[PDB]
Design an enzyme around this catalytic site. Structure first.
Site, mmCIF file in Angstrom:
data_model
loop_
_atom_site.group_PDB
_atom_site.id
_atom_site.type_symbol
_atom_site.label_atom_id
_atom_site.label_comp_id
_atom_site.label_asym_id
_atom_site.label_seq_id
_atom_site.Cartn_x
_atom_site.Cartn_y
_atom_site.Cartn_z
ATOM 1 N N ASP A 11 -10.166 83.468 -42.467
ATOM 2 C CA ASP A 11 -9.382 82.237 -42.247
ATOM 3 C C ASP A 11 -8.469 81.938 -43.454
ATOM 4 O OD1 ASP A 11 -9.013 79.683 -40.442
ATOM 5 O OD2 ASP A 11 -9.574 78.898 -42.422
ATOM 6 N N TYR B 124 -3.927 72.967 -46.828
ATOM 7 C CA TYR B 124 -2.916 72.820 -45.760
ATOM 8 C C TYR B 124 -1.701 72.023 -46.176
ATOM 9 C CZ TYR B 124 -6.391 74.181 -42.186
ATOM 10 O OH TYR B 124 -7.289 74.842 -41.399
ATOM 11 N N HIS C 299 -13.674 82.064 -33.502
ATOM 12 C CA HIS C 299 -13.102 81.847 -34.829
ATOM 13 C C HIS C 299 -14.046 82.123 -36.012
ATOM 14 C CE1 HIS C 299 -10.606 80.425 -38.011
ATOM 15 N NE2 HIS C 299 -11.593 79.614 -38.409
HETATM 16 O O1 LIG Z 1 -5.885 76.590 -39.629
HETATM 17 C C1 LIG Z 1 -6.669 77.481 -39.919
HETATM 18 N N1 LIG Z 1 -8.016 77.402 -39.677
HETATM 19 C C2 LIG Z 1 -8.571 76.516 -38.689
HETATM 20 C C3 LIG Z 1 -9.930 75.976 -39.135
HETATM 21 C C4 LIG Z 1 -10.557 75.090 -38.071
HETATM 22 C C5 LIG Z 1 -10.622 75.779 -36.707
HETATM 23 O O2 LIG Z 1 -11.115 74.783 -35.804
HETATM 24 C C6 LIG Z 1 -11.753 75.231 -34.649
HETATM 25 C C7 LIG Z 1 -11.971 76.560 -34.328
HETATM 26 C C8 LIG Z 1 -12.592 76.894 -33.141
HETATM 27 C C9 LIG Z 1 -12.986 75.887 -32.284
HETATM 28 C C10 LIG Z 1 -13.641 76.273 -31.023
HETATM 29 O O3 LIG Z 1 -13.772 77.423 -30.626
HETATM 30 O O4 LIG Z 1 -14.070 75.159 -30.386
HETATM 31 C C11 LIG Z 1 -12.781 74.552 -32.592
HETATM 32 C C12 LIG Z 1 -12.161 74.231 -33.784
HETATM 33 C C13 LIG Z 1 -9.224 76.237 -36.306
HETATM 34 C C14 LIG Z 1 -8.683 77.206 -37.341
HETATM 35 N N2 LIG Z 1 -6.328 78.671 -40.539
HETATM 36 C C15 LIG Z 1 -5.011 79.041 -41.042
HETATM 37 C C16 LIG Z 1 -5.175 80.342 -41.855
HETATM 38 C C17 LIG Z 1 -3.808 80.840 -42.347
HETATM 39 C C18 LIG Z 1 -3.188 79.769 -43.247
HETATM 40 C C19 LIG Z 1 -3.010 78.457 -42.473
HETATM 41 C C20 LIG Z 1 -2.072 78.694 -41.283
HETATM 42 C C21 LIG Z 1 -2.669 79.759 -40.348
HETATM 43 C C22 LIG Z 1 -2.875 81.069 -41.139
HETATM 44 C C23 LIG Z 1 -4.037 79.276 -39.856
HETATM 45 C C24 LIG Z 1 -4.395 77.986 -41.988
#
Ligand SMILES: O=C(N[C@H]1CC[C@H](Oc2ccc(C(=O)O)cc2)CC1)N[C@]12C[C@H]3C[C@H](C[C@H](C3)C1)C2
Ligand SMILES: O=C(N[C@H]1CC[C@H](Oc2ccc(C(=O)O)cc2)CC1)N[C@]12C[C@H]3C[C@H](C[C@H](C3)C1)C2
Lengths: 546, 546
Positions: free
Chosen positions: A334, A465, A523
């Site tokens: 991530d 972020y 994820h």
């Molecule tokens: O946002 C990023 N992580 C989140 C963290 C929380 C998760 O929440 C979830 C995930 C799964 C579920 C489910 O299955 O219910 C619910 C909530 C979603 C992803 N990662 C990045 C990593 C790099 C840098 C920047 C921009 C781009 C590329 C994405 C952040």
């Protein structure tokens, strides 16, 4: 009612039995039957072998004594030993060939998980051979899965003497009827049985285990694939490095060999790598599982800019400077995955090899703002919700238990909709107040994250972020570069934000790129599919990170 | 008035200059003069080399561009390049051959000790070659001795552009007249000189350093042998392992390679190995400098038996279990020296190699009590004084500063008489209340021991002496054993308690025993003679501990 299980090492927890070398060597060298076995046990309780097993003498002191016994036995049998016959050679080969009996260890693991007290009771020696490490490693792997390890050479007692059995009962704090005793030697079972213990003569593992499950009433045979070994936070070595006057980084460290630095994502912990830490250490690596800046025991300064990729990467370089590490293999997931590609881009001399789970290498678009680029994807809406300081902090810190339970879910367990998060008003608008426990996690594991997040909360983590423009400007300096160091991209089929197709053009930037893929994986890759993550990383490490 | 010194890397801090390979390769390959140098600088500020030095491209991306330039230069000069000519081969050899210019680093070290702000300003590249580690290691060793490292490829600026010089002044927070600038390239000195800085064209080190001492008024040339690099407690990685519910062990960790566990004596610290930690890490080892049980950040339970050799050794085995280390080389001094011989005797599978400073291997006399054996030696009287709980604690904890200043002294500095200690009434009866500072230690170093001893005091440390009968009974189990793993005994001529002649019969127990000897060395070996300790340990580690 059984409460404890005792296992022998040779012929029970480890196969092939070292005693079996003497029979096969005799057969290979066409020597008389039982000659090597009789010279080994020569003198009984007063013999060289009993002295060895009691700890009176070391293995290297024993070798010439066994050589005398072999000569004496050949003299009586009226036969001659070969010209270049060596007891050290025979024993070195016997020890190195002996491996953990995986199904027996699995049964021991299952009995302990079910509340049993488990122990290894073995007749062994003080090994001072040049190649003692092989055996040292074997014992280390095995011992950590048992409550006790009783070695004859350390207690000055030997099986079948009745004293070692009373010592075992005392160590166990159990009466004989509460103990199952597994042994491949019938003579060593007799005293345990005579004391009143349940005994199992171990010939083939399958029957031994069939006898074990019958007497315990617990399924051990042909049971599902177990999860890899996890980490108990209190049993780990905890490391602390000050990278700047106000910033200290915490890490968990396990193993020896090339340094492997594990970088978690949002909103996680070093503990997100719990199933990878014992596996990568056992595979021959020195694992350093980080608490990234803003998390757990690592410092969490309040200022947004303390969390831009430039500062985070410089501090990871300093972390290596202070530990005296010229390089490390960098494995990220991530937000940690993004950090590692930028480590490879800006500091290739410090990165032995780079690997990412889910996060593709995404090069900055110089002709577009990242805020514009984010808006182009409806699945990325939550990132705009994360922008305003305080808003996502207040909602995420309101109920820590709810936060992690809602987040940490398998692909078919989703209770959260990351689309239209801004318009809804929050992350948990039409989400349960008391989510069910995911099959990926236990209540205890969720509570470790709750406890970790009580110190600094979500400001530091959310600040990762809040540096879009700063990160974009910095990334643009690397637009003419390529990633030419060893690199692994691992995609997760069911990651609905970091979709595998987002990694499609990575070979334009990383031509020698290797890949891994995990189907039916959400994820939270490491805890969703730990077995396959370990298999992919270990295979890639041995081939590319040496 | 000069307050800062700036040094270039290539041709200044590291020799031979990588630029010099192009001249010698031309001469070896009988190529036209300056051909390789002209193809290297081809295109000037818009050329492939400037792009490399600015960080626009990586070294591996640059190699084919330099190959094109070389072909273009041979085409114009009307000459042909050899059939198997390789820029990667030439550059790989140039980088690996380049080593630290020790006298220049010494001068930089001296200027910093004298209050100067020091920095490395270098035109360099992002190294992604398979063999980048060699250069990574070089930079790690060098960088840690300077306040700043400015690399052209990281700042996106290059020498001789006037911007990198203003960036340097800003980083330094100094006006040009307060800066000495050392460079081997006259064209790169011009802007610093034009800004008003003192500049030194570096040809031979000797003249450069002669010019340096004249402008600074500080002796740098032919000055005495400097002490090895020491440790700043706040800059180290601090590790914490729980070995038992009530017992946690602390250690300082530096380097990569085979694990080297350092075990201090009484009444010391991990900091007693301050001069060995950076040297053994630089020599290719992963150093783990312990705070032994009862000391510093390690737990100090009150009970006497918590400090018997059996418990201490079992806990050191657990320390390895929890860190995932199958083995470690064990190096001890004084009480740590005794602990390590017993680690080799009872756990040879866990000990890669064993080394002791001053402490001989002394086998228990089964026909005599240790109290009897101690009484036979008048120099051992202080050990009887250490027996009664509270007595030595009260005298040693009364004035911490006095305690360490009185104890930590060179052989010709003694203010304490360890003979007739019991009859006198104490350790400091006819000892000064305010002892002079020893030449071995600074006030700051003594104060680190004072600060460390404020937590637990002397109960735990003194308890190491309060297990004579228990240790004796345990040691008697090993009376038939020999030490057959690699072993080093280091004697100190002037240690008047642990006299070299006390080690005379060690080969009867350890036949393959290797030896080291230090003349004009008192009890506090590591701080008395750090340079020779490092030389003896490093030589022995590379030969026997691999
Ligand atoms: O946002 C990023 N992580 C989140 C963290 C929380 C998760 O929440 C979830 C995930 C799964 C579920 C489910 O299955 O219910 C619910 C909530 C979603 C992803 N990662 C990045 C990593 C790099 C840098 C920047 C921009 C781009 C590329 C994405 C952040
Ligand atoms: O007593 C042990 N250390 C002392 C620590 C304090 C130091 O005090 C000094 C040393 C030097 C001076 C000076 O030059 O003025 C003054 C005081 C004297 C030595 N070491 C052992 C190590 C093993 C196990 C056990 C018995 C035997 C073998 C000796 C303890």
């Amino acid at each position: 009612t059984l409460r404890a299980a005792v296992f022998d090492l040779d012929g029970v927890l480890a196969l092939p039995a070292v005693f079996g070398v003497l029979g096969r060597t005799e057969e290979a060298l066409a020597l008389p039957r039982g000659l090597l076995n009789d010279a080994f046990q020569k003198g009984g309780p007063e013999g060289a072998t009993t002295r060895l097993m009691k700890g009176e003498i070391t293995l290297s002191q024993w070798i010439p004594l066994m050589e005398e016994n072999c000569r004496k036995c050949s003299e009586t049998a009226k036969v001659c030993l070969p010209k270049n016959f060596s007891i050290k050679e025979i024993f070195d080969k016997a020890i190195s060939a002996r491996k953990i009996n995986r199904p027996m260890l699995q049964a021991a693991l299952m009995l302990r998980k079910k509340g049993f007290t488990t122990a290894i009771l073995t007749n062994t020696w003080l090994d001072d051979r040049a190649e003692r490490d092989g055996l040292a490693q074997l014992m280390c792997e095995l011992k950590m899965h048992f409550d006790f390890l009783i070695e004859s050479c350390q207690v000055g007692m030997v099986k079948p003497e009745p004293q070692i059995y009373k010592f075992l009962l005392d160590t166990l704090k159990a009466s004989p009827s509460e103990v199952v005793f597994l042994d491949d030697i019938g003579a060593n079972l007799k005293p345990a049985r005579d004391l009143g213990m349940v005994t199992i003569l171990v010939q083939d593992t399958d029957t031994a285990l069939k006898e074990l499950e019958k007497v315990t009433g617990i399924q051990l045979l042909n049971t599902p694939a177990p999860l890899p070994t996890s980490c108990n936070p209190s049993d780990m070595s905890h490391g602390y490095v000050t990278v700047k006057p106000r910033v200290r980084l915490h890490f968990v460290e396990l193993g020896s060999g090339p340094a492997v630095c594990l970088c978690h994502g949002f909103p996680e912990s070093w503990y997100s790598w719990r199933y990878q830490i014992p596996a990568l250490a056992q595979a021959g690596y020195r694992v350093l599982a980080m608490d990234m800046k803003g998390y757990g025991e690592s410092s969490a300064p309040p200022e947004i800019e303390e969390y831009c990729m430039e500062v985070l990467c410089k501090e990871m370089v300093t972390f290596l400077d202070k530990l005296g590490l010229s390089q490390a293999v960098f494995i990220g997931h991530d937000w940690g995955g993004m950090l590692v590609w930028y480590m490879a881009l800006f500091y290739p001399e410090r990165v032995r090899a780079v690997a990412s789970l889910n996060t593709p290498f995404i090069p900055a678009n110089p002709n577009m703002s990242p805020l514009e680029s984010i808006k182009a994807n409806p699945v990325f809406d939550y990132q705009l919700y994360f922008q305003e300081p305080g808003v996502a902090e207040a909602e995420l810190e309101q109920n820590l238990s709810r936060t992690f339970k809602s987040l940490f879910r398998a692909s078919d367990e989703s209770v959260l909709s990351m689309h239209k998060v801004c318009e809804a008003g929050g992350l948990f608008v039409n989400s349960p107040e008391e989510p069910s426990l995911s099959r990926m996690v236990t209540e205890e594991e969720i509570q470790f994250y709750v406890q970790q997040f009580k110190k600094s909360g979500f400001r530091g983590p959310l600040n990762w972020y809040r540096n879009m423009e700063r990160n974009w400007k910095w990334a643009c300096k690397s637009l003419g570069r390529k990633i030419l160091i060893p690199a692994l991209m691992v995609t997760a089929e069911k990651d609905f934000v970091l979709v595998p197709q987002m990694s499609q053009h990575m070979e334009d930037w990383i031509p020698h790129l290797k890949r891994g893929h995990i189907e039916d994986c959400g994820h939270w890759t490491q805890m969703d599919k730990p077995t396959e993550v370990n298999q992919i990383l270990i295979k890639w490490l041995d081939s590319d990170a040496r």
